[PDB]
Amino acid sequence: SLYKGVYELQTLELNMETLNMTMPLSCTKNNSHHYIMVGNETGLELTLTNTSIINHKFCNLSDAHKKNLYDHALMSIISTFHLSIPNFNQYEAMSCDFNGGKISVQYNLSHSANHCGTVANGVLQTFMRMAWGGSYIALDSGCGNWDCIMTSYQYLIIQNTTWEDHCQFSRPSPIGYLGLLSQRTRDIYISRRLL
Amino acid sequence: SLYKGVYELQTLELNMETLNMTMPLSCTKNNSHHYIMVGNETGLELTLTNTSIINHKFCNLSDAHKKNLYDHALMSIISTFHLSIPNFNQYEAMSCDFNGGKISVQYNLSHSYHCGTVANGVLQTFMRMAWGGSYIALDSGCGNWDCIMTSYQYLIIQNTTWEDHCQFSRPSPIGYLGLLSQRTRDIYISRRLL
Amino acid sequence: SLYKGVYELQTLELNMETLNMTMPLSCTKNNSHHYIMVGNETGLELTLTNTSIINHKFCNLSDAHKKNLYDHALMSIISTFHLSIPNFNQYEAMSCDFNGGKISVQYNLSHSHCGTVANGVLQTFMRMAWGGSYIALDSGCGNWDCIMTSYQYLIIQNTTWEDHCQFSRPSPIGYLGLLSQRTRDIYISRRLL
């Protein structure tokens, strides 16, 4: 396709997997399973599902930090994800488990009539931005809705897994994570006077 | 006037009230009362006064967060206000009351009494939140950053209904939008592991 | 040195000490001692050493805040330094003492070698004292994730102003750079922060 007689339109597509040795890379397998890979060994599985895996209200961050059996990169990703959630106030909605250096975090999206002021929308907005390549299919509506985002699934599960080429629906990318880095603690609530 | 023989000087004045549905809008009513408005519905009233409304030294934010019952935009504004207070160390200076979902926050400016004190930090954040004309409330008005002080004893932030209070200065999002960037820049550590 | 037969190369070295009344200024004295001066009066001394001074696992920040006997500028510097640490997750690694308005902070670097708390503390030390912190580190460059020193303790103590700067000139660059990274690398320790 030549423009003004002499200018051919040519396309260029970046192989983004080569950025694996410096930064995380996030992709979508299908609407229920999404992934964020940190190198060629490990990563986190972001699963939207109706089946709960954590059935307790304990999360125990301090014990996990003291033991220090976890991967530091993965915990940094978890911290960025949580601190990017706008207006998080219902702490019972979140639970987690770190026994033996594992990472397993569960957000209860069924904790929620208008369905626009809920914590589930903060969780789903941050999930959408974290897996920005292909998260849009997992939501009820692809666009035209930010404050009132919803999905039919009841739980979001962020759990550590092994590396494997899951990137079927969208190609891997760091853009969601790198965008979320600048927004940490930007729209969170105070919880104590002195902080 | 007319410049270079062909250029007439003309002016604009932006109708900033039309930004109401997207962002807060702050203005000054008189010396003591200032306001920030959220929607055409609600907002916070910032009153500098000598009369307290909270006589206790408790502020349990976590219990309010558990129950919800509050307008999330207003509590976001409160969090943006408090987090941007530079060098806040006297926790007893601030009290609050969220019973029934309302918002009431009281900063005791007389607790810390000349320069480089807690009251000055609270007034620095107040002047930025209500930058549209809050300079009248502060004593000097200008030439003072670390020594800002006002004759009033308490700063009281209370949720209110919408009303055209913007007599002294026009409504503006500029103060709030400025405070968003400079959010956690001057918080002291109170813990080894935050 | 004349370039093009037209232009003479001329140099320019800025005296940063005139920024003393507006911002901190950091410099290096020798391998072990580094300094950050505030005003013509006060400052902090950052000493890498094999000898501890605190010898307890307490750091009563909350009590120091109520007593309010300390220098606010120095405690702001300490707050920026601590919150700039990448992945501080060992609360026992740090101790301090604020008796009577004093400031005496200690980081135990013995907890080690790549990707540990001591490396993060040494990274933040490198940025805070950027004017000559490289001499203390085992490798001057070519290393970020495995920075290590032979010293077990980094000790930050409030001191008096004096012409400490021998190895590098005073400079605000480390502090001003750390102000932007002040909170962007923090672990969550609690669900509702």
Partner: antibody, heavy 124, light 109 residues
Framework: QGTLRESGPGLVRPSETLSLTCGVS?????????WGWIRQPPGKGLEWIGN???????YYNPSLKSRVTVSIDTSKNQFSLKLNSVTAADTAVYYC?????????????????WGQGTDDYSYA | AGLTQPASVSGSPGQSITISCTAA?????????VSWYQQRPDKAPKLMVY???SRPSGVSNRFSGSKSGNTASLTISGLQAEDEADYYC??????????FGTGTKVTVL
């Protein structure tokens, strides 16, 4: 659940020091609860003496602030009151108490070591 | 100084009775988390109400508290003869100090 039990001298003379020990069985004093002494003179209303916390911090009545000490011994699982310069007005029944209060001073101090606590503070 | 409280309240079986507990207007900050205790004769006080109407397990729903302004109160709905006891209100003063009332002698007629 558990019990609290006073033990000490049932008789002191004027100007000597009363010393009462409260033993706690079935509850751990190292749990986040405030251990206190209340007083009932024989026929009058209740008067709160004081309390101590596992951090060692103590809080006292303003009237009874110069004469009283309250100590905690977690190793034997007990706490105790020491009231010096006793007088006739100090004749009374002394009660132990487990209190679910939240003092901000002890809250902010234990955040790193003991982590996030509960929110079921009865304040009673 | 101590919280003002009625010296005696009384009623017949089955009716509701109210025991008030009033603080001075100069000590409103000392009037918080008003909790109510029953002391039977020659027994230790037992907590009946804490916060506002929250009660320990085993305490019936007949005991219910309220708080407004400078005053609080305990309502015993459906009074019975076993409710005769000395009722004490106490507030948690913001200097971390429990302040008791003077005690109410409930009489059942």
């Amino acid at each position: 659940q558990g019990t609290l039990r006073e033990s000490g001298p049932g008789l002191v003379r004027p100007s000597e020091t009363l010393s009462l020990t409260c033993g706690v069985s079935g509850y751990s004093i190292s749990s986040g609860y405030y251990w206190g002494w209340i007083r009932q003179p024989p026929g009058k209303g209740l008067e709160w003496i004081g309390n101590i916390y596992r951090s060692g911090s103590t809080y006292y009545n303003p009237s009874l602030k110069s004469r009283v000490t309250v100590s905690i011994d977690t190793s034997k699982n007990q706490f105790s009151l020491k009231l010096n310069s006793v007088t006739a007005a100090d004749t009374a029944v002394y009660y132990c108490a487990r209190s679910g209060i939240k003092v901000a001073d002890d809250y902010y101090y234990e955040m790193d070591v003991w982590g996030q606590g509960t929110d079921d503070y009865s304040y009673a | 100084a101590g919280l003002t409280q009625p010296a005696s309240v009384s009623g017949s079986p089955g009716q509701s009775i109210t025991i008030s507990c009033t603080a001075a207007n100069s000590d409103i900050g000392d009037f918080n988390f008003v909790s109510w205790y029953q002391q039977r004769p020659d027994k230790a006080p037992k907590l009946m109400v804490y916060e506002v109407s929250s009660r320990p397990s085993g305490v019936s729903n007949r005991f219910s508290g309220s708080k407004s302004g400078n005053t609080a109160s305990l309502t015993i709905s459906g009074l019975q003869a076993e409710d005769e006891a000395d009722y004490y209100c106490t507030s948690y003063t913001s200097s971390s100090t429990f302040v008791f009332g003077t005690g109410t002698k409930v009489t059942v007629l």
